[PDB]
Design a binder for these strands. Sequence first.
RNA 1: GAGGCCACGCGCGCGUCCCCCGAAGAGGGGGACGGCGGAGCGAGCGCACGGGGUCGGCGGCGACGUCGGCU
Length: 48
Amino acid sequence: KAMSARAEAIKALVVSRKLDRLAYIAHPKLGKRARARIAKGLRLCRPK
RNA sequence: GAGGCCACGCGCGCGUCCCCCGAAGAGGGGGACGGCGGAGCGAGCGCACGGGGUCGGCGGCGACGUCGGCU
């Protein structure tokens, strides 16, 4: 009974920062898409 | 408005901030930043204070007198 009472009580629901940005890009997983963006920037050149 | 530095450099759209007119301080027109968004790839020569020396540098001397042998 104590386990059930506890279980039902628990289930009762209702800028830039350059140095921070570079550490984010250097992350192997968090910065994967970020450093892919800058790679395409190095290659492609487009007007406008 | 008659210099110095930057390990700052593609677009499109999204966001954040700043600017304009603002004809509801609506609605569009512009700048800056972004760590945001589903879609592949740079190669080709070199120089080196770069994961422990190499020269694609050279000279002299050599048989009955001398050459080498730290034992």
